[PDB]
Design an enzyme around this catalytic site. Structure first.
Site, PDB file in Angstrom:
ATOM      1  N   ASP A  34       1.448  -7.701  13.746  1.00  0.00           N
ATOM      2  CA  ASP A  34       1.415  -7.896  12.308  1.00  0.00           C
ATOM      3  C   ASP A  34       1.377  -9.373  11.962  1.00  0.00           C
ATOM      4  O   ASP A  34       2.393 -10.060  12.048  1.00  0.00           O
ATOM      5  CB  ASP A  34       2.630  -7.261  11.675  1.00  0.00           C
ATOM      6  CG  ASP A  34       2.595  -7.330  10.174  1.00  0.00           C
ATOM      7  OD1 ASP A  34       2.491  -6.263   9.530  1.00  0.00           O
ATOM      8  OD2 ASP A  34       2.676  -8.455   9.638  1.00  0.00           O
ATOM      9  N   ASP A 224      -4.060 -10.001   7.628  1.00  0.00           N
ATOM     10  CA  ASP A 224      -2.901  -9.185   7.954  1.00  0.00           C
ATOM     11  C   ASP A 224      -3.284  -7.971   8.782  1.00  0.00           C
ATOM     12  O   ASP A 224      -3.730  -6.959   8.256  1.00  0.00           O
ATOM     13  CB  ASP A 224      -2.176  -8.745   6.683  1.00  0.00           C
ATOM     14  CG  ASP A 224      -0.892  -7.990   6.978  1.00  0.00           C
ATOM     15  OD1 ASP A 224      -0.527  -7.878   8.175  1.00  0.00           O
ATOM     16  OD2 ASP A 224      -0.256  -7.505   6.012  1.00  0.00           O
TER      17      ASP A 224
HETATM   18  O1  LIG Z   1       4.676  -8.155   4.675  1.00  0.00           O
HETATM   19  C1  LIG Z   1       3.703  -7.636   5.199  1.00  0.00           C
HETATM   20  O2  LIG Z   1       2.506  -7.432   4.582  1.00  0.00           O
HETATM   21  C2  LIG Z   1       2.517  -7.802   3.207  1.00  0.00           C
HETATM   22  C3  LIG Z   1       1.344  -7.044   2.597  1.00  0.00           C
HETATM   23  C4  LIG Z   1       0.577  -7.807   1.538  1.00  0.00           C
HETATM   24  O3  LIG Z   1       0.359  -9.144   1.954  1.00  0.00           O
HETATM   25  C5  LIG Z   1       1.631  -9.770   1.931  1.00  0.00           C
HETATM   26  C6  LIG Z   1       2.390  -9.312   3.154  1.00  0.00           C
HETATM   27  C7  LIG Z   1       3.675  -7.104   6.608  1.00  0.00           C
HETATM   28  C8  LIG Z   1       4.691  -6.002   6.736  1.00  0.00           C
HETATM   29  C9  LIG Z   1       3.958  -4.762   6.310  1.00  0.00           C
HETATM   30  C10 LIG Z   1       2.480  -5.005   6.514  1.00  0.00           C
HETATM   31  N1  LIG Z   1       2.377  -6.436   6.887  1.00  0.00           N
HETATM   32  C11 LIG Z   1       4.269  -4.463   4.866  1.00  0.00           C
HETATM   33  O4  LIG Z   1       4.091  -5.251   3.949  1.00  0.00           O
HETATM   34  N2  LIG Z   1       4.800  -3.190   4.772  1.00  0.00           N
HETATM   35  C12 LIG Z   1       4.859  -2.634   6.047  1.00  0.00           C
HETATM   36  C13 LIG Z   1       5.319  -1.388   6.390  1.00  0.00           C
HETATM   37  C14 LIG Z   1       5.299  -1.058   7.728  1.00  0.00           C
HETATM   38  C15 LIG Z   1       4.813  -1.944   8.673  1.00  0.00           C
HETATM   39  C16 LIG Z   1       4.361  -3.195   8.308  1.00  0.00           C
HETATM   40  C17 LIG Z   1       4.409  -3.526   6.977  1.00  0.00           C
END
Ligand SMILES: O=C(OC1CCOCC1)[C@H]1C[C@]2(CN1)C(=O)Nc1ccccc12
Ligand SMILES: [Zn+2]
Ligand SMILES: [Zn+2]
Length: 394
Positions: A34, A224
């Protein structure tokens, strides 16, 4: 880097994950990769959705930091206890590294059922680490403790009772020239918090959206690997859709399709790829007034999902969605390309991927350079909060 190829797995739309070991003796765990976060976090309690979790008490090398961490997302949430232990990557480099691990003790909407991963490996910069920027992220620890070049690269490769399995490669510590065709092109990392880039022009089927290029980067554009979709700011999104609607107009789709909420289907193998336009994002180049474009196909932004009912159909989910937090170049985009996260030179590399999916007419592309005379500034500057402003960094 022979031994790093194919080191990622996962299910479609549910994230690519690498096998890591942590602790002594080595507890083995599947960890989500990630590039839009900067914490190393692992399930350390039992959860409905976890087969197996990190047991600190079973590691001689584990040290408790007697600090808590609490980490909300926009969708999803988890908290845990901070510590350090020995960590390595079996199909990564042949080293072991001491690193910070957030041990997750509770969580709402974080672990995905069937996704087969039990942790997250954020590979972004300390600035957005929690609870603050002094918690040294995994990749920083890795470089600091070993002779592994401050670089990695990701080739995320393509996608009837389960989701489709996906594959890819995370090459830690350089570039593998069998993973990409053609030239490799670099955009500046505007700033080291997110992997933030800048977009300077957008075309849908060779047609300019003709927007002030700040709109493409409002309030930020990032890469991302843990986001499935191409996320775009509202104004950019709506124009994208108008334009994709336009070219696809022979076909009339329910509102819910474009909202990412519903599937559309055709007869097995008769899907009409040619009424859907390629999208071209031009990214800022290393040289002023220079840019280079990445082109992505409908095969990338229409995501195949295998229906239980009509399994004699090919069914697709629209994987462009709306954002209030700027552009997110997720797995949909990356899946066209070998992407190289060159932290040492504060830049991101794109090339056409040796695995990318395509039809016989069109192909995902990396093509440059292009030049603009008096190319203005396409960066956005995020309003500075007083909270943000009052932090001391010593
Ligand atoms: O913070 C992040 O992504 C955000 C998205 C928009 O761009 C700003 C950063 C990381 C963590 C993540 C996906 N990538 C998320 O957000 N929920 C989530 C839920 C499960 C796994 C990973 C994630
Ligand atoms: Zn101070
Ligand atoms: Zn600081």
């Amino acid at each position: 880097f022979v031994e790093m190829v194919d080191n990622l797995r996962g299910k479609s739309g549910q994230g690519y994950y690498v096998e890591m070991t942590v602790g002594s003796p080595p507890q083995t765990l599947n960890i989500l990769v990630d590039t839009g976060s900067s914490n190393f976090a692992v399930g350390a309690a039992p959860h409905p959705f976890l087969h197996r979790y990190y047991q600190r008490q079973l590691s001689s090398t584990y040290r408790d930091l007697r600090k808590g961490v609490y980490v909300p997302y926009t969708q999803g949430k988890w908290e845990g206890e901070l510590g350090t232990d020995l960590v390595s990557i079996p199909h990564g480099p042949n080293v072991t590294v001491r690193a910070n691990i957030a041990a997750i003790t509770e969580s709402d909407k974080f672990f995905i059922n069937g996704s087969n991963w039990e942790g997250i490996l954020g590979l972004a910069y300390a600035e957005i680490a929690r609870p603050d920027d002094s918690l040294e992220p995994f990749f920083d620890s890795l470089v600091k403790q070993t002779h592994v070049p401050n670089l990695f690269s990701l080739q995320l490769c393509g996608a009837s009772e389960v989701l489709a399995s996906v594959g890819g490669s995370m090459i830690i510590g350089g570039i593998d020239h069998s993973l990409y065709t053609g030239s490799l092109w670099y955009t500046p990392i505007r700033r080291e918090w997110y992997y933030e880039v800048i977009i300077v022009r957008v075309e849908i089927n060779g047609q300019d959206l003709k927007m002030d290029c700040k709109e493409y980067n409002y309030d930020k554009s990032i890469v991302d690997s843990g986001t499935t979709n191409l996320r775009l700011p509202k104004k950019v999104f709506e124009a994208a859709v108008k334009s994709i609607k336009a070219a696809s107009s022979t076909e009339k789709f329910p509102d819910g399709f474009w909202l990412g909420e519903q599937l559309v289907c055709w007869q097995a193998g008769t899907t009409p790829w040619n009424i859907f336009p390629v999208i071209s994002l031009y990214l800022m180049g290393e040289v002023t007034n220079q840019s280079f474009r990445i082109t992505i196909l409908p095969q990338q932004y229409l995501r195949p999902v295998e229906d239980v009912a009509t399994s004699q159909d090919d069914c697709y989910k629209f994987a462009i969605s709306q954002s209030s937090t700027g552009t997110v170049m997720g797995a949909v985009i990356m899946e066209g390309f070998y992407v190289v996260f060159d932290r040492a030179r504060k830049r991101i590399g794109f090339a056409v991927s040796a695995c990318h999916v395509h039809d016989e007419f069109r192909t995902a592309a990396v093509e440059g350079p292009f030049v603009t005379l008096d190319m203005e500034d396409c960066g956005y500057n995020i309003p500075q909060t007083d909270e943000s402003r009052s932090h001391h960094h010593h």
